[PDB]
Design a protein around this ligand. Structure first.
Ligand SMILES: Nc1nc2c(ncn2[C@@H]2O[C@H](COP(=O)(O)OP(=O)(O)NP(=O)(O)O)[C@@H](O)[C@H]2O)c(=O)[nH]1
Ligand SMILES: Nc1nc2c(ncn2[C@@H]2O[C@H](COP(=O)(O)OP(=O)(O)NP(=O)(O)O)[C@@H](O)[C@H]2O)c(=O)[nH]1
Ligand SMILES: [Mg+2]
Ligand SMILES: [Mg+2]
Ligand SMILES: [Mg+2]
Ligand SMILES: [Mg+2]
Ligand SMILES: [Mg+2]
Lengths: 62, 18, 198, 450, 95, 102
RNA sequence: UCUGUUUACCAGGUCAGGUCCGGAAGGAAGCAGCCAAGGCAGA
């Protein structure tokens, strides 16, 4: 990603980030209940979050 | 009855994966 | 199909429950007796209630000797001894019945394999033919049927039955595309003359 | 075998968080192509999957937001309400007389199903059953019914090919009313729905008998023609219900769905083996769950069938363990009794919690292993069975040589009996709720499989 | 409060016999929550995320045990447990 | 700049397999490779019920030092040594003897 | 000369179960249970 996210406005990013947090919450809720088969997902989302955040900053920064 | 379920359930079962 | 030149030429009939194996055997028996072939029948269904009697009745109607044994006896046995009586009467073709079995049971597939091995041990070259009977009302599940049946007994042929119904039996296309197994006959009713060449 | 395709499908969905409607779509498409691979009523595939598509758009669950639980739950419950809304317990309504007919296509399983019903209702009803074959057409069909009837211990009414089906069934009904029977099972010849002389003939038959129930018999492998068959049989004959057979094959038998779409008649029974005992009450929860791979209804039904055939023998093993303690006598009794109820697919489907950790391709052959155990413990002197700790090297040479097997196997079996001895003791000493709750599922660390 | 903080509070359902007991008998659920979250934020977060009505949240802190792995002495991390009272009104279930 | 890679057909210079040829399954970081039909060991496996793993002696393939295997020239039928050049703008491998690309 | 009792494989017979050969037809080595029996104690 990260080219893809780069072309979105700050608002859509802010809707995306919250979505990612809901997804993350749900995922670790699954993993905590031992119902999670693919674990590769946590890392997927946990990192995507960072990506988004790192953009928000530079859009405010400059 | 109970003791039936108890015994044979984890008898058959517990025999398979253990 | 060429049944010429063997003492006898033996055809194994395989397929899941109710597809038309025993009736098809009847039909083939007629078809080849019409061509001047000497034909006899193995009832290789010693498992299901009246599975042998049913074929014996067909053979009684067609004046075709049917080798028969008790319920609970071995199918492969009746098939072998049928090959033997076949040789003894100097006949061209024995048609070996088998009990219906679901292809995914997979022990019964092995039973069929055993039968094959039997016909192999009597006549080293036999059977030269393994035919799978498929119902027309069936379909892409019969894909899987063709899979486990061909994987098991190495089918040399396929006969589609109940094509007198509304079913087009299109699943053949997907089967023949996969396994390259030739379609031999189409069954078009419940009488003795109801077999047709594909 | 939808579970291969449906597993990749709905498991795929159950992975992705806040799933796009596109993999929702693709998954629906794989359910469509899956039921298309099952040769279930292809137009009805399209209809069913369109329904599942519309249902799967807007659901929310606070328990777990996972959309895969939504697709599994939706496909399940929807197949449930379309298949008759959890009708297991209900079955057929019994009146003091009852007359039921079995109708359908050539080879669907009618004659077999008649004898299954005979046995089942013989067990549940505590009443008298009479059966009759209206089939003068298929060779030895009447004899087939006679054999099955003799096997299930059910009175048989004689008939021959020289008669007319109407006269036959009229005679049967007359004798039945005269001899005070209740449940009557009439097995009819297989016939094409487009064969007018036959369909008319049995319209006349029905007219003569006046049955309370007409059951259409469906091979689970039946194709797209099902909807056309069910309708035809429902328009002339009309049927009051459906029996779905050969569900022990990998065929998904959703064709009955088409059959229940046109007819609207309930589906009462699941034929699940070639044996007389193989009649089950149909249940959409059981067939849909059976497709999905994890089941609560079939878990309670196979634990209640295991418990029904094993009640007096686990009370015999509990009385001998009350007197002499747990031995290879009480274990061997458990083995023969356990071999009589034996099946593997009805066992793994009862436990979804263990099947979530282990591959679904796991199978121990019960007919092999069980009878092997019975055999090995049949090779022991009675002192070695009541006192297993004295079994030694030469003894296991003797046991292994007796049944014609390997010493390693005997070691393995005595190992099993050792574990079950321990388990018997742990069950004996502790309270039932504590011994059942204190059982631990061990991971050598939370990191999985290692 | 901000929602972004909320979604970061609640780690996991706590599973045990005590837990089940309260859940059945007193209508109460048991949570492992971030070490720093407070009764306010947990009330907020359950009421928000599970969308059900919280009465009161009682909490405690569990000191992790001390372990040995291959002679080495480690310390399991601390954490915070929360007994969360739901009003008789709602019925909370694991599907 | 890695000389021996996945799926190359190689010939074995050293060890009990000297002279044998085969196909590379994978490489390991330590400079070890694992080759088809090469360097079978008989390993004893304690039966594991969770993985439905039976017991017994499993013949398995054990890693071999990559210095000991040579990239097999199919043209010459001889073991070869490898080198690198730039064709197009891309870095490519070739055989030293006939100086032909791979 | 009779009674109880015991005595796992390695005296004997039947040899269930299971297992080898065969396609079967059927044989077969034989564990267990039973009977002599090895005894002995009591008479
Ligand atoms: N309409 C029609 N019916 C057929 C045809 N071939 C067989 N049948 C019918 O289908 C039914 C089953 O036939 P049968 O020969 O017993 O099949 P099977 O495969 O031998 N049964 P099993 O597996 O129980 O031994 C019989 O009623 C029979 O008359 C056909 O070409 N058309
Ligand atoms: N595996 C399995 N086989 C079944 C089941 N129900 C019936 N069968 C089998 O399918 C075959 C056909 O059954 P049968 O009772 O003759 O069907 P039918 O509908 O009476 N045939 P017909 O139309 O000729 O009268 C028989 O081999 C039988 O043992 C089932 O639920 N499972
Ligand atoms: Mg037949
Ligand atoms: Mg019938
Ligand atoms: Mg308080
Ligand atoms: Mg406090
Ligand atoms: Mg720490």
């Amino acid at each position: 990603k990260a080219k893809e996210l780069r072309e979105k406005s700050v608002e859509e990013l802010n809707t995306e980030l919250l979505n990612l947090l809901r997804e993350q919450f749900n995922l670790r809720m699954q993993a905590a209940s031992g119902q999670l088969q693919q674990s590769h997902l946590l890392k997927q989302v946990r990192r995507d979050v960072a990506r988004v955040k790192t953009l928000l900053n530079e859009k405010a920064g400059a | 009855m109970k003791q039936s379920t108890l015994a044979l359930l984890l008898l058959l079962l517990l025999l398979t994966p253990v | 199909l060429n049944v010429e030149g063997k003492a006898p030429f033996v055809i194994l009939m395989v397929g899941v429950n109710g597809v038309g194996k025993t009736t098809t055997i009847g039909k083939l028996a007629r078809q080849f007796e019409q061509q001047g072939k000497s034909v006899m029948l193995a009832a290789g269904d010693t498992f299901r209630a009246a599975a042998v009697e049913q074929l014996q009745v067909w053979g009684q109607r067609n004046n075709i000797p049917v080798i028969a044994q008790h319920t609970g006896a071995d199918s492969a046995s009746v098939i072998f001894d049928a090959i033997q009586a076949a040789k003894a009467r100097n006949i061209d073709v024995l048609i070996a019945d088998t009990a219906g079995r679901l292809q995914n049971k997979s022990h019964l597939m092995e039973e069929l394999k055993k039968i094959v091995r039997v016909m192999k041990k009597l006549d080293v070259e036999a059977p030269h033919e393994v035919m799978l009977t498929i119902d027309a009302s069936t379909g892409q599940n019969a894909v899987s049927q063709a899979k486990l049946f061909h994987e098991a007994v190495g089918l040399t042929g396929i006969t589609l039955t109940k094509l007198d119904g509304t079913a087009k039996g299109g699943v053949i296309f997907s089967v023949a595309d996969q396994f390259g197994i030739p379609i031999r006959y189409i069954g078009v009713g419940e009488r003795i003359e109801d077999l047709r060449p594909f | 075998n939808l579970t291969d395709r449906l597993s990749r499908t709905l498991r795929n969905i159950s992975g992705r968080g806040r799933l796009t409607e596109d993999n929702v779509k693709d998954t629906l498409r794989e359910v469509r192509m899956a039921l298309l691979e099952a040769d279930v009523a292809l137009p009805v595939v399209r209809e069913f999957i369109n329904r599942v598509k519309e249902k799967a758009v807007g659901h929310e669950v606070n328990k777990s937001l996972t959309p895969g639980q939504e697709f599994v739950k939706i496909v399940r419950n929807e197949l449930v309400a379309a298949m008759g809304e959890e009708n297991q317990t209900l079955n057929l309504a019994a009146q003091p007389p009852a007359v039921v007919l079995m109708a359908g296509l050539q080879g669907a399983g009618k004659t077999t199903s008649v004898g299954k019903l005979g046995k089942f209702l013989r067990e549940k009803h505590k009443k008298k059953v009479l059966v009759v074959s209206a089939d003068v057409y298929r060779p030895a069909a009447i004899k087939q019914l006679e054999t099955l009837a003799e096997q299930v211990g059910v009175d048989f009414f004689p008939s021959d090919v020289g008669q007319k089906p109407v006269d036959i069934v009229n005679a049967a009904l007359k004798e039945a009313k005269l001899k005070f029977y209740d449940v009557l099972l009439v097995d009819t010849a297989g016939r094409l729905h487009v064969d007018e002389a036959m369909m008319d003939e049995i319209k006349q038959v029905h007219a003569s008998i006046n049955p309370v129930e007409t059951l259409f018999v469906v091979d689970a492998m039946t194709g797209q023609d099902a909807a056309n068959t069910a309708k035809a049989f429902n328009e002339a004959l009309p049927l009051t219900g459906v029996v779905l057979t050969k569900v022990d094959g990998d065929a998904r038998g959703g064709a009955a769905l088409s059959i229940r779409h046109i007819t609207g008649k309930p589906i009462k029974f699941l034929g699940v083996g070639e044996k007389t005992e193989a009649l089950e009450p149909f249940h959409p929860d059981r067939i849909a769950s059976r497709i999905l791979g994890m089941x609560x209804x079939x878990x309670x039904x196979x634990x209640x069938x295991x418990x029904x055939x094993x009640x007096x023998x686990x009370x015999x093993x509990x009385x001998x363990x009350x007197x002499x303690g747990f031995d290879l006598n009480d274990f061997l009794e458990q083995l023969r009794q356990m071999k009589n109820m034996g099946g593997x697919x009805x066992x793994x489907x009862x436990x979804x919690x263990x099947x979530x950790x282990x591959x679904x391709x796991x199978x121990x052959x019960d007919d092999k292993v069980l009878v092997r155990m019975e055999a090995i413990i049949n090779s022991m002197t009675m002192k070695e069975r009541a006192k297993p700790e004295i079994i030694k090297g030469s003894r296991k040479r003797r046991i292994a040589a007796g049944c014609g097997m390997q010493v390693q196997d005997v070691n393995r079996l005595l190992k099993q009996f050792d574990d079950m001895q321990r388990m018997m003791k742990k069950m004996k000493k502790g309270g039932x709720x504590x011994x059942x709750x204190x059982x631990x599922x061990x991971x050598x660390x939370x990191x999985x499989x290692x | 409060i901000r929602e972004e903080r909320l979604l970061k509070v609640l780690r996991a359902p706590h599973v045990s016999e005590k837990a089940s007991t309260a859940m059945e008998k007193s209508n109460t659920i048991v949570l492992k929550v971030a070490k720093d979250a407070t009764k306010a934020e947990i009330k907020a977060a359950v009421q928000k995320l599970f969308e059900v009505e919280v009465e009161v949240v009682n909490t405690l802190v569990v000191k992790g045990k001390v372990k040995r792995h291959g002679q080495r002495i480690g310390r399991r991390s601390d954490w915070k447990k929360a007994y969360v009272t739901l009003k008789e009104g709602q019925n909370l279930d694991f599907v | 700049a890695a000389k021996i890679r996945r799926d190359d057909e190689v010939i074995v210079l050293t060890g009990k397999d000297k002279g044998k040829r085969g196909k590379v399954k994978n490489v390991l970081s330590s400079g070890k490779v694992i080759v088809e039909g090469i360097n079978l060991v008989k390993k004893h496996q304690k039966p594991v019920p969770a993985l439905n793993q039976p017991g017994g002696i499993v013949e398995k393939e054990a890693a071999i030092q990559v210095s000991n295997v040579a990239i097999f020239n199919a043209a010459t039928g001889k073991a070869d040594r490898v080198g690198f050049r730039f064709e197009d703008g891309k870095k490519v491998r070739f055989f030293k003897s006939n100086s032909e690309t791979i």
